[PDB]
């Protein structure tokens, strides 16, 4: 499961939550992975999906809706897009 | 003659129980009295915060 591996990333690794910030992380070429909630707007997703394709970056569609993902980042707010810059000691990146 | 009497009403006069016809809330509405207070205390709080007297968390 992905929730478990994220937990560790959020604890120990470096990361960034949200679309304005993750698109800046990909555009820098630092972002190693991009998680998308399922409810994300369709235009947004396809835009991000293209940005990863240009930057040769992983894109993982999360199983849950943006409330679940934010819950799954350990935040009381809700996150639709999340980039993983440096995982701490997790194998979120395979 | 009125002006003179209004000056009496300032001193606190012709204003006792037996010269009131309206309910207290009609005479000074509780909502307005509340509105004043919030608009005071809140104004006091954000002045305190914006002088670094009190921190974010205290303020809240």
């Amino acid at each position: 499961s992905i929730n478990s591996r994220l937990q560790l990333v959020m604890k120990s690794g470096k990361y960034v939550l949200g679309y304005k910030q993750t698109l800046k992380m990909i555009r820098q070429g630092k972002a190693k992975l991009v998680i998308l909630a399922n409810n994300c707007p369709a235009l947004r997703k396809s835009e991000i999906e293209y940005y990863a394709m240009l930057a040769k970056t992983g894109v993982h569609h999360y199983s849950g809706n943006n409330i679940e993902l934010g819950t799954a980042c350990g935040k009381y707010y809700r996150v639709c897009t999340l980039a993983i810059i440096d995982p701490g000691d997790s194998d979120i990146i395979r | 003659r009125c002006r003179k009497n209004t000056l009496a009403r300032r001193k606190g006069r012709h204003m006792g129980i037996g010269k009131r016809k309206g309910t207290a809330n009609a005479r000074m509405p509780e909502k307005v009295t509340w509105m004043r207070r919030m608009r005071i205390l809140r104004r006091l709080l954000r002045r305190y915060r914006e002088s670094k007297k009190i921190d974010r968390h205290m303020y809240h």
Binding site: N39, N65, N66, I67, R78, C80 | -
Partner: protein, 91 residues
């Protein structure tokens, strides 16, 4: 039960209309004024606009739903059946 023991939303109606009717209204009267979650952004803003039409204020997604609920049960059960048959037809 701060202000009322057992009328809540239907305390507006006062004594009128009878106990059963007012109890019967309390169910709907609640649900219809409820703010639901916009399964589109995920904010709690799905609010009935008029009968059968619910609008997210943020999402701006107007959504044909039930008369007093964003979803009827009937609609939900119909949805799943159609999805099942769709898969049965095409394979």
């Amino acid at each position: 039960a701060k202000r009322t023991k057992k009328v809540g939303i239907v305390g507006k109606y006062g004594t009128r209309y009878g106990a059963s009717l007012r109890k019967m209204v309390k169910k709907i009267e609640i649900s219809q004024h409820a703010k639901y979650t916009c399964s589109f952004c995920g904010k709690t803003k799905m609010k009935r606009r008029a009968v059968g039409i619910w609008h997210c204020g943020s999402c701006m997604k107007t959504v044909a739903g039930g008369a007093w609920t964003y979803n009827t049960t009937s609609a939900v059960t119909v949805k799943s059946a159609i999805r099942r048959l769709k898969e049965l037809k095409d394979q």
